[PDB]
Structure 1
Amino acid sequence: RGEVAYSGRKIWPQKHTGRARHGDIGAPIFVGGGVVFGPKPRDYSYTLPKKVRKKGLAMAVADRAREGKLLLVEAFAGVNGKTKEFLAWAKEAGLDGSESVLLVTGNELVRRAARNLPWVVTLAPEGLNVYDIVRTERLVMDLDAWEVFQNRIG
């Protein structure tokens, strides 16, 4: 009510008018009035225990591994960013879009090639986060990315 473009002038005298008691057409009341406990800008971010983040990252992977739905790689025949090519190597690897795949690798060329696939979510190894591992069905890391992962688990 203190931020609307209205004047703080008392609208009508306090007594003897036959009307309700009011002040400035800027208080919660009155349509054009101000809003009571409305939203204000605010930061919804909190610091989560790093140990908890670590545990979860692993847990996320482990769990994916238990279903045998994990699959790390050494390299990619179809390298040199080009979907057609990735789609190629895809067959070979057992990926056909039946399942959504989280493909994490430090090779920008590969990254570029997958990416546009509706079923592919792509990340750089140092971007491995729990949310993504879970939103996808199958997880595909290269060995150089399985390391960064290691250098982060305890």
Structure 2
Amino acid sequence: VYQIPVLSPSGRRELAADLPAEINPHLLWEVVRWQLAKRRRGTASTKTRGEVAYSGRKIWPQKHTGRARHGDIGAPIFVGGGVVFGPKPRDYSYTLPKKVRKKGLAMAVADRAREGKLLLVEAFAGVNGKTKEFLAWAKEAGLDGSESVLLVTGNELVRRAARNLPWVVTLAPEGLNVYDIVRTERLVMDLDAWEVFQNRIG
């Protein structure tokens, strides 16, 4: 149902994939929202009038001093005092429905597929862990680095080789996720990568 360029020794063949016809930008948004929230450290903290260092002695008597009434100086009304409803350690994560992630994974790839920006590749020529090697291959495959690439492959040698390029984000196929797809302009996969993704969206 979509036709996807595949790079090969034969040359530029095609491959038919059933990826969603329609894209639901809201859902894609929901998946990214979830991804980015769950990576949050949750580490902003503050002290309450109870957690502040001062003593609980009432500073001056309730009446007849001619001053305002106060209790202890930890109260949030004092400079130095505690903070009201400030941040405490927090878990920002939540369990986004699995089918939503699945549907999302698929739609994101689908979106690139529909733009021609998805490229499948059989293997990587001479790339044996050197950036110049990947760089060669890349050029030869139409990646001049003018467009950001999410390079997905299980080949550790290919990932190291590409990882330092500012325009390349790299991933193992088990790691494929929608923020990374959406963040980058172009999607490049191993067939073996593409195989697991198919197995994942199944």
Aligned with 1:114: secondary structure? helix
Distance 2:142 2:53 in 1: 63
Q: Deviations over 1:31-86 (max 9, x none)?
A: 01110010000100000000000000000000100001000100011221000000
Distance 2:113 2:89 in 1: 41
Distance 2:64 2:137 in 1: 86
**Structure 2 gaps, min length 5:** 1-48
Distance 1:56 1:34 in 2: 44
Aligned with 1:72: secondary structure? strand
CA RMSD of aligned residues (A): 0.5
Q: Deviations over 1:110-144 (max 9, x none)?
A: 00100000000000010000000000000000000
Deviation at 1:91, TM superposition (A): 1.0
TM-score, scaled to structure 1: 0.99
Q: Deviations over 1:9-44 (max 9, x none)?
A: 000000001000001000111101110010000100
Distance 1:90 1:80 in 2: 13
Q: Name the count of aligned residue pairs.
A: 154
Percentage of identical aligned residues: 100
Structure 1 consecutive aligned stretches of length 4 or more whose deviation exceeds 4 Å: none
Aligned with 2:163: secondary structure? coil
Distance 1:27 1:72 in 2: 63
Which protein has the larger Cα radius of gyration, Structure 1 or Structure 2?
A: 1
TM-score, scaled to structure 2: 0.76
Match of 1:119 among 167, 173, 176: 167
**Structure 1 gaps, min length 5:** none
